[PDB]
């Protein structure tokens, strides 16, 4: 009776009347005497006592008492829909779910009503009012459904218009206060939970073909009470994590939002972070972080923005879960392997022309090149709300506070070094994904970095040397000591040292100070389809450019050496010892520049 | 990357690193540094401590690949062990493309082995084999060992105690250059054979309630994998048929069955393909499975040592686990009483209300 009451209001919006003219039957066609002939199908009408119409294969049945709808008047305006919801729906109660079609109709009415006045100034009024309505009448109903994804898809298609704070309010209230203290909701939640655990006990590498579909249906229909057992089971078991990340490919946006919700729930639940024994971190942080990284890697419609706001926020207080999630995100999605163990030949190839570098990286088991698209997506998540500079400064100034703690040295050294490597790897990712003008736009330019925050000079140059070399080489208009002008260079004590030597040391690199020319030939000879695109477009063009660069740099160093114990002391003090203690390439480069630059 | 302290080839280092090896055992660090120089080695160690890896890394170090030249010959006792040694050579030679490995054992046409030996695409520098088949190849000049530099004999005790095996290995040894590297490896070298956290519980009940009880336990306990110990093959196969009928994926392994299917199902369950496995005491010793977290002793054994061997399949390398046993007769309680006196362990009676799941994970 309610659906008949509401139908004419529903057709007036979400206009289907213009599309009503497509419910017709195929004409019976027959070939007689060698010509086509069309006829209509013939049916007859019977009257029965059953209320719902039907059509049993030749004839149509109808309810006999054809004026039962005489005493009722359909709605004329959504306001009447509210006024009569308060009577019929407050009676039907949580059982509205027994008829899915009503959910769809009311939700589409809501969507069209919100879309009708996108321009007007009073939109927030209608948004608040529909928020209250969906909170009180529809969401408890949709919590009752049984393996029926599309209805929840519709309700969420309406919910998409709210601030996410409100969606979290509704979800959490439904979880805490309305699951208990209401009977049919409690029954449905308990049934769904028991069924979810029953399925979770039977996930295998061999039975995934059907268990994945069943789990997808069950999670998509009634997520926020069937997800928590799954979240715990992957919180402390090994392979269920990979299995779940495999089966996320199937559920709709509602499951996605609820999944992100319960992830924040578990990440914020009150419990200890460090292991009971000592300073070792607990055994769930790692598996949860692996899960989150797998999510960011595989399913690309996940929208983990709020988790990244969690990171950017809770790093301020030094939460270990933030650092861990960041490490696993960088290493799994981005593909940025560290430089702890590198043979001298690989270390050499790792800074050369493009193809030699690519071969070196693929040899060191690094896959940053093949992951360009998803790395760009993640850095786009980071780009919004301008988290880049805040995160770099946070990581840096956090490692210092880690240096000033008190513990056993055997853990202090390892912690400090681990933070250092994490920062280095993050900056490698940032330089890989943000190029051109976007870099200079969202990476906090040099002089502020070095004068306001007092970063140590090696990190400053480690960020800016590539961009400075690029702006110097092509656009020969500007010159060094101008594009880096104004820097205070605080710990340097530029007295009693030629700033020419300073900037000539830190500006350069290894690629522009050493030409082997043997590795190029080795690669060219071992590479001899179209012959691999003609030896990768005659890789040797990069070697030619490399020769030109070597020649220009050596020409520079000639006049510079024509130009230049106190200096011999301060040079070691502030120029080669700080440079060597960095990653290996800085050490090799300090070695090479010690020679070929002096008498 | 402890093997990086070994100062070996980088591609070999990557092939070891992708094999999960991170810290060498005692026997590896004690033997590989000296075997790399080409000295003969005679090794005795406890089984399963990575004795194959020693000489595998050694021969992958000392080899300089020469086309069509066989320098490395390994002789074993079985065909499946030969397959395992060639698989080890393959997982060790991932980053070595020029080197080629081959395996020789009975049951295959000798002409196919010959033609693959003549093929340049399959001309092997490393050959693992059974002594009889490789003897039949050398004596027919199907393979040339005039340039062999490395001779490995695994399980050398059985190689030298059996007369046919020692004669075959000596015929292979006399056809090799005398100035070669020689290595023998075995877990058992008697004196007679060139300058060489676990939780323990029990259920005392009657037989006719077992089938429903597990159907409850296997329903409530949170588990990765479950193993079911039985005393007979018929009861085990029946319980597996019923469990698979119970929407519970389960496998069965025991005697009275062809070895092929035993290896097949053993390997299958090792790979996390199903979550329930049932076996008699055939796997009472030697088995190594990590993910088993919950064990159900359907029928107790006769002696305490067999029960401890059973429970050893859980809590591998000092990890956490849960064990629960069935008691249905007098000798069951007898062995239950004897295990505590020998092993100093209180096997309490399993409470009805269940145990905290975190007490075993």
């Amino acid at each position: 009776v309610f659906e008949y009451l509401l139908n004419p209001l529903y057709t007036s919006m979400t206009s289907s009347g213009e599309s009503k003219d497509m419910a017709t039957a195929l004409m019976i066609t027959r070939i007689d005497n060698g010509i086509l002939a069309h006829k209509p199908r013939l049916i007859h009408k019977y009257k029965t006592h059953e209320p719902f119409e039907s059509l049993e294969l030749n004839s149509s049945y109808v309810f006999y008492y054809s004026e039962w709808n005489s005493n009722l008047t359909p709605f004329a305006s959504v306001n009447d829909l509210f006024e009569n919801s308060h009577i019929y729906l407050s009676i039907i109660g949580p059982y509205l779910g027994r008829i899915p079609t009503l959910l769809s109709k009311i939700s589409r009415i809501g969507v069209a009503d919100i879309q009708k006045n996108h321009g007007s100034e009073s939109l927030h009024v209608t948004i608040d009012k529909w928020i209250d309505y969906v909170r009180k009448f529809i969401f408890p109903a949709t919590s009752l459904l049984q393996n029926n994804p599309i209805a929840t898809s519709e309700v969420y298609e309406l919910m998409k218009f709210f601030p996410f704070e409100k969606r979290y309010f509704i979800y959490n209230e439904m979880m805490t206060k309305l699951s208990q203290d209401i009977l049919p909701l409690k029954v449905s939640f308990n049934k769904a939970e028991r069924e979810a655990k029953s399925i979770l006990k039977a996930l295998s590498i061999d039975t995934i073909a059907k268990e994945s579909r069943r789990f997808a249906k069950l999670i998509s229909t009634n997520p926020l009470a069937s997800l928590v057992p799954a979240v715990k089971q992957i919180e402390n078991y090994d392979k269920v994590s990979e299995l779940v990340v495999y089966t996320t490919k199937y559920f709709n946006d509602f499951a996605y939002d609820v999944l992100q919700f319960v992830l924040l729930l578990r990440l914020t639940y009150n419990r200890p972070a460090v292991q009971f024994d000592g300073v070792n971190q607990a055994m769930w942080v790692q598996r949860l972080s692996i899960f989150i990284a797998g999510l960011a890697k595989n399913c690309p419609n996940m929208d983990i923005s709020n988790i990244i706001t969690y990171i950017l926020k809770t790093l301020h207080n030094g939460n270990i879960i933030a650092v861990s999630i960041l490490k696993e995100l960088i290493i799994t999605v981005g593909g940025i392997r560290d430089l702890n163990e590198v043979n001298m030949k690989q270390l050499l190839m790792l800074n050369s022309g493009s193809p030699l570098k690519q071969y070196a990286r693929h040899l060191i088991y690094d896959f940053r090149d093949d992951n360009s698209v998803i790395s760009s997506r993640l850095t786009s998540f980071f780009t919004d709300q301008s988290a880049i500079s805040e995160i770099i400064l946070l990581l840096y100034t956090l490692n210092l506070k880690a240096n000033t703690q008190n513990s056993h040295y055997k853990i202090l050294s390892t912690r400090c070094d681990e933070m250092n490597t994490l920062l280095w790897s993050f900056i490698e990712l940032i330089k890989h994904c943000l190029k051109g003008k976007a870099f200079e736009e969202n990476v906090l330019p040099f002089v502020e970095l070095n004068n306001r925050f007092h970063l140590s000079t090696p990190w400053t140059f480690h960020i800016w040397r590539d961009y400075l070399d690029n702006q110097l080489n092509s656009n020969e208009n500007f010159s060094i000591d101008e594009l880096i002008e104004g820097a205070e260079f605080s710990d340097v004590d530029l007295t009693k040292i030629s700033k020419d030597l300073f900037t000539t040391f830190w500006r350069l690199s290894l690629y522009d100070i050493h030409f082997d020319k043997s590795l190029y030939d080795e690669r060219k000879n071992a590479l001899s389809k179209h012959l691999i695109q003609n030896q990768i477009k005659d890789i040797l063009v990069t070697g030619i450019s490399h020769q030109r660069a070597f020649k220009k740099t050596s020409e520079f160093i000639s006049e510079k050496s024509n130009v230049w114990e106190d200096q011999i002391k301060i040079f070691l003090q502030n120029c080669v010892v700080p440079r060597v203690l960095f990653s290996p390439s800085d050490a090799l480069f300090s070695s090479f520049f010690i020679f070929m630059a002096f008498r | 990357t402890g093997f990086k302290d070994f100062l070996l080839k980088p591609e070999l280092s990557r092939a070891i690193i992708d094999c999960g090896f991170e810290h060498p055992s005692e026997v590896q660090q004690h033997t590989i540094p000296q075997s790399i120089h080409g000295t003969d080695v005679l090794c005795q160690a406890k089984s399963g401590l990575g004795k194959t890896a020693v000489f595998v890394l050694s021969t992958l170090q000392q080899l300089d690949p020469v086309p069509g030249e066989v320098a490395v010959v390994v002789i074993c006792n079985a065909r499946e062990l030969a397959y395992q040694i060639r698989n080890e050579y393959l997982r060790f030679s991932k980053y070595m493309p020029d080197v080629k490995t081959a395996v020789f054992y009975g049951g295959t046409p000798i002409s196919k082995d010959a033609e693959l030996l003549k093929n340049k695409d399959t001309a092997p520098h490393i050959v693992v084999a059974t002594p009889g088949r490789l003897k039949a190849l050398v004596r027919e000049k199907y393979i040339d060992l005039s340039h062999v530099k490395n001779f490995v004999i695994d399980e050398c005790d059985k190689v030298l105690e059996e007369l046919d095996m020692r004669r075959d290995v000596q015929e292979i040894f006399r056809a090799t250059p005398r100035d070669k590297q020689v290595m023998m490896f075995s877990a058992t070298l008697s004196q007679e054979i060139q300058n060489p956290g676990l939780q323990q519980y029990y259920i005392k009940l009657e037989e006719r309630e077992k089938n429903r009880k597990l159907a409850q336990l296997l329903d409530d306990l949170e588990f990765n994998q479950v193993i079911i110990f039985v005393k007979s093959t018929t009861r085990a196969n029946e319980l597996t048929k019923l469990l698979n009928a119970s929407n519970f994926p389960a496998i069965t392994v025991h005697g009275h069955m062809k070895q092929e299917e035993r290896i097949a199902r053993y390997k299958a369950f090792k790979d996390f393909e199903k979550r329930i496995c049932v076996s008699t005491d055939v796997f009472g010793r030697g088995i190594d499975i990590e993910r088993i977290n919950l064990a159900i002793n359907y029928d107790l054994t006769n002696e305490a040592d067999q029960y401890l061997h059973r429970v050893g399949r859980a809590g591998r390398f000092g990890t956490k686990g849960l064990a629960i046993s069935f008691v249905s007769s007098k000798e069951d309680e007898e062995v239950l009483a004897k295990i505590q006196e020998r092993f100093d362990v209180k096997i309490a009676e399993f409470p009805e209300e269940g145990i905290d799941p975190s007490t075993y994970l």
Binding site: - | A215, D219, E238, L243
Partner: peptide
């Protein structure tokens, strides 16, 4: 009906799949 429903909800009932459908 209320009591039976609440009990069958909170406690739940084990659906016998192969329970007691054999012996030995």
């Amino acid at each position: 009906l209320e009591t039976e429903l609440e009990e069958e909800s909170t406690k739940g009932v084990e659906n016998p799949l192969a329970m007691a459908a054999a012996l030995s």
